[PDB]
Design a protein around this ligand. Structure first.
Ligand code: CUA
Length: 119
């Protein structure tokens, strides 16, 4: 179990700078640091290449959230203080909706993101 401090994740560590969310970690491998908030995803959109292995590293800045990529079997709970890891290779270019699968308050019904898979 991989633990982080939710009260400092916006200020120190790999989720602190939103411009640095996508990091190449092998010839055809990218790690993506996703930070869920009430009520949006950081970064948005997430842009990745077709056929590369993606390693998502997902945590929460406040309350329990969900992270589900429509059209795949990616569906994880996202807890403050914990890192959820998911590995996946996207074979078809195009756009996929990201949906929050855990009730999280006022604007839960509007918490959407996007992943763009480039040709
Ligand atoms: Cu985040 Cu519902």
């Amino acid at each position: 179990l991989e633990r982080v401090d939710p009260t400092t994740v916006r200020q120190e560590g790999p989720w602190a700078d939103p411009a640095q969310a996508v990091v190449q970690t092998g010839p055809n491998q990218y790690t993506v640091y996703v930070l869920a908030h009430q009520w949006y995803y950081q970064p948005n959109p997430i842009e990745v290449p077709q056929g590369a292995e993606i390693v998502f590293k997902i945590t929460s800045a406040d309350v329990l959230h969900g992270f589900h990529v429509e059209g795949t079997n990616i569906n994880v709970e996202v807890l403050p203080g914990e890192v959820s890891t998911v590995r996946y290779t996207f074979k078809r270019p195009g756009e996929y909706r990201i949906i929050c699968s855990e009730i999280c308050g006022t604007n839960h019904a509007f918490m959407f993101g996007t992943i763009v898979v480039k040709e």
